[PDB]
Design a protein around this ligand. Sequence first.
Ligand SMILES: CO[C@@H]1COCC[C@@H]1[NH2+][C@@H]1CC[C@@](C(=O)N2CCc3ncc(C(F)(F)F)cc3C2)(C(C)C)C1
Ligand SMILES: CCCCCCCC/C=C\CCCCCCCC(=O)O
Ligand SMILES: CCCCCCCC/C=C\CCCCCCCC(=O)O
Ligand SMILES: CCCCCCCC/C=C\CCCCCCCC(=O)O
Ligand SMILES: [Zn+2]
Length: 324
Amino acid sequence: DVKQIGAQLLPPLYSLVFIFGFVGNMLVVLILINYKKLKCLTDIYLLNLAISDLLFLITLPLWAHSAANEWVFGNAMCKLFTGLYHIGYFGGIFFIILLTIDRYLAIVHTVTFGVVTSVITWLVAVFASVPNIIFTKCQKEDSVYVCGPYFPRGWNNFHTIMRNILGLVLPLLIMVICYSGILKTLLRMKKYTCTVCGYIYNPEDGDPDNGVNPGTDFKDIPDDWVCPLCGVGKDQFEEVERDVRVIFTIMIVYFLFWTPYNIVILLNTFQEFFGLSNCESTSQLDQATQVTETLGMTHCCINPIIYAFVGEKFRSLFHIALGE
Ligand SMILES: CO[C@@H]1COCC[C@@H]1[NH2+][C@@H]1CC[C@@](C(=O)N2CCc3ncc(C(F)(F)F)cc3C2)(C(C)C)C1
Ligand SMILES: CCCCCCCC/C=C\CCCCCCCC(=O)O
Ligand SMILES: CCCCCCCC/C=C\CCCCCCCC(=O)O
Ligand SMILES: CCCCCCCC/C=C\CCCCCCCC(=O)O
Ligand SMILES: [Zn+2]
C-alpha cells in the first residue's frame, strides 16, 4: 500500500532532510552575512535562495507527523504551513532565475538593486502562494483528518497550468535564453600577439589600414603581412591565452527534483487531453503524485550540498564557518 510506505518512509526521511537542510542552509545564510558581507548581487540572491529553502524546510516536521498521524494542528496551521511550503517553493525557483539572469547580464552584456529585486520577488512568491492558502484546509477524509487541497475543478486546472508555467516553462525558457547567450560569448576567433612589442591582433577588428578586413582569421592573412607597430613578420606571432557552474547546477538539480511532480500533476489534471482517463491510470497517477512530491520535497536540503562539491571557494568558507 502507498499509505503504509508513506507512514514508514516519510517521518525519518523528512526529519533527516529537515536536519541536514537546516544546518546546511543556516551555514550558507551566516557565511554570506558574516564572511561575504552581502557586497555583491550574487550574495544577496544566494541569501534569499537559502531563506527560501529554510521557509520550505521548517514545514517538514509537520508533514513528517502527518505521514504517520492525522492532521492535529487545525485549519490555521494547515493554511500557514501550506503558505510557507509555496513561498519557499516559488521563492526558491525565482531566486535561481535571478541568479541565472545576473550571470547572463555580467557575461553577455548595487545593494539597493538587490534589495528591490529581492523584495519584489518575495512579493510574487507570496502572490503565487495565495490560491493554495485559500483552497487548502483541514477536512475529514473518510475516517481521518487531512490537511489537503479542495480546489473546485476550474481552480485545479488553473493551479496545475500556473504551477507548470512558473515552475517549468518560465525557468526552462530563462535557461535556454541565458545559457545559449552565455555559450555564444565563449565561442570566439583566436587572437595572436606579437612576441616583440606586444601588439594583439584581434580578428573582430582585423587590420584595415594594411589590407585585412574586420573578421579575417590570422591564418588567412598573407605571409607578406607585418606587425603594424614594430614591423616584424607573421612568423613572430604567438597565440593569446567560474560562478556559472554553481548557478547552472543549482537550476539543473532543481529540474531533476521538481519536474517529475509538475508533469505528473499536469497528466493527472488533464487526463482526457493525454488519454489517461481510464480507472487503472488514475490510481497510478495518484500514487505517482505522492511519490514525485516526496522527491521534490527532499530538494530544500540540496543547494548547500551543491555549493560544497561544485564551489571550491564555498568549500573553504564552510570549513571556516564550522570552526567558528
Ligand atoms: C497540505 O498540502 C501540502 C502543502 O500544499 C501543497 C501540497 C502539500 N502536500 C503534503 C506534503 C506532505 C504530504 C506528502 O508528502 N505526501 C502525501 C502522502 C504520501 N504518501 C505516500 C508517499 C510515498 F509513498 F511516496 F512514500 C508520499 C506521500 C507524499 C503528507 C505527508 C501530509 C502531502
Ligand atoms: C511577509 C509575509 C506576507 C504574508 C501575506 C499572506 C497573505 C495571504 C494569507 C492569508 C489568506 C487568508 C484566507 C485564508 C482562509 C480561507 C479563505 C476562504 O476561503 O474563506
Ligand atoms: C533531467 C530533468 C528532467 C527530470 C526528469 C523528467 C522525467 C520524468 C517525468 C515524468 C514521469 C511520469 C511518470 C508517471 C507515470 C506514467 C503515467 C501513467 O500512470 O500512465
Ligand atoms: C536526496 C535525494 C533523495 C532521493 C529520494 C527521494 C524520493 C523517494 C520517494 C519515494 C520512494 C518510493 C516509494 C514508492 C511507493 C510505491 C507504492 C506501491 O507500489 O505500493
Ligand atoms: Zn610588433
